[PDB]
């Protein structure tokens, strides 16, 4: 069956370049147009361009948003489609999907790869600070602030506490660093005796933190 | 460029019900050049319907499409649990190819007003020079809600950020966290910190507040 595998994504600074590869198998790659589609974190889908098959001229089309910066090419002898990404901006941060364009009069995008994440940022790797969200049923939590890059993982009591846990999506701050909160609701009558610890792991910086959260004095 | 406007933004239905999704185009589009895609949580999009009405390979019979010109419809005759996902329409008859903004099909439940909690910045963070005030809205439905930060009765605008969980698998509610960011100097110049919450399940806004230093 059809398989499309994107690669070449990762962290890149603004103004630099990246080339994504899309390795195709299970079909005659050279017979089909190929197209790239991207999805910024939490947003919708945006067409980034297509390239026709060699038999139909092998030329490309791109939207205005990436015109002059992104170029699609293909190597039919290797069954690989490429996306050359120049002059990258933070707005280019997205998961990039490679797709096969269906033959005939109705050229939908019939098959999609798993996607590869491209993060455009000038930020440096940094582990988070973990601050308590102290309870005044009561709610408590952990503020995991100023880390880069994504992701961090959060558990409570080493995974033994799951009921009432909400770990929120991270927000990108104007500093270019991320921040997220994880909260849990617990019985108020239990605060005096039960210990609650959030376990934070930021693998890109080798930062692991165990934060005990208790009512403030 | 042809703008595709999908409605409603969120479709709240129960499993086994019929789902009707709309995609309206700012310009006439031949049905031949419209397609529908499904994106399940954490997954890549996949083709459902193309040519407005033709099914992609392996897509189950309950998905069907119709429409021509400017108003197109995706119908799911009976919602199965795995059908709760995001659906995108797409036109490829004019350049640039464009997608709609997406419609989410979520589980419908009864209205639940949020529980509100406010957290002052920790003393540990205050030594660092910055202050984060966090407002938590817990286990509410539907998803739409508004948080307003007030500092000594001054409405704050442009200095907060929000994050929302996905629909809970057990009770189908949402939760929201909002962080108000101030410098330590700004934080210590004021007394009353409040977040005011509105939700269609609240007859009047709910305010949780603290006085700095108590």
């Amino acid at each position: 069956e059809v398989q499309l595998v994107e690669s070449g994504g990762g962290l890149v600074q603004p103004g630099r370049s990246l080339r994504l590869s899309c390795t195709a198998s299970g079909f005659t790659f050279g017979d089909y147009a190929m197209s790239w589609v991207r999805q910024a974190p939490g947003k919708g889908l945006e067409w980034v361009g297509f390239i026709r098959s060699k038999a139909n001229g092998g030329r490309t089309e791109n939207p205005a948003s990436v015109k002059g910066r992104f170029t699609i090419s293909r190597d039919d002898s290797k069954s690989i489609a490429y996306l050359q990404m120049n002059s990258l901006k933070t707005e280019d941060t997205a998961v990039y999907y490679c797709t096969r364009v269906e033959l005939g009069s109705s050229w939908s995008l019939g098959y999609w790869g798993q996607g590869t994440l491209v993060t455009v940022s000038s930020a440096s790797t940094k582990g988070p600070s973990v601050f308590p969200l102290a309870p005044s049923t009561a709610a408590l939590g952990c503020l995991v602030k100023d880390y880069f890059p994504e992701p961090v993982t959060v558990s409570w009591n080493s995974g033994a506490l799951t009921s009432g846990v909400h770990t929120f999506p991270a927000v990108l701050q104007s500093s270019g660093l991320y921040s997220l909160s994880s909260v849990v609701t617990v019985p108020s009558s239990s605060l005096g005796t039960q210990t609650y610890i959030c376990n934070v792991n930021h693998k890109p910086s080798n930062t692991k933190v165990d934060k005990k959260v208790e009512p403030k004095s | 460029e042809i703008v595709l406007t999908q409605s409603p933004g969120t479709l709240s239905l129960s499993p086994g019900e019929r789902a009707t999704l709309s995609c309206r185009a700012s310009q006439s589009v031949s049905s031949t050049y419209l397609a529908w895609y499904q994106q399940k949580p954490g997954q890549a999009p996949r083709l459902l319907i193309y040519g407005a009405s033709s099914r992609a390979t392996g897509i189950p019979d309950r998905f069907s499409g119709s429409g021509s010109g400017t108003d197109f419809t995706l119908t799911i005759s009976r919602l199965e649990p795995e059908d709760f996902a995001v659906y995108y329409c797409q036109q490829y008859g004019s350049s640039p190819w464009t997608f709609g903004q997406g419609t989410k099909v979520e589980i419908k439940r009864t209205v639940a007003a949020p529980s509100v909690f406010i957290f002052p910045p920790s003393d540990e963070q205050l030594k660092s020079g910055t202050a984060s005030v966090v407002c938590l809205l817990n286990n509410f439905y539907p998803r739409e809600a508004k948080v307003q930060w007030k500092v000594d009765n001054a409405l704050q605008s442009g200095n907060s950020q929000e994050s929302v969980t996905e629909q809970d698998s057990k009770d189908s509610t949402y939760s929201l966290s909002s962080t108000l960011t101030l410098s330590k100097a700004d934080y210590e110049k004021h007394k009353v910190y409040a977040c005011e919450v509105t939700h269609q399940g609240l007859s009047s806004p709910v305010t949780k507040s603290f006085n700095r230093g108590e």
Partner: peptide, 12 residues
């Protein structure tokens, strides 16, 4: 009918 620049299956 269809803009040639929108058609990926035909050489313009």
């Amino acid at each position: 009918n269809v803009d040639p620049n929108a058609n990926p299956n035909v050489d313009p």
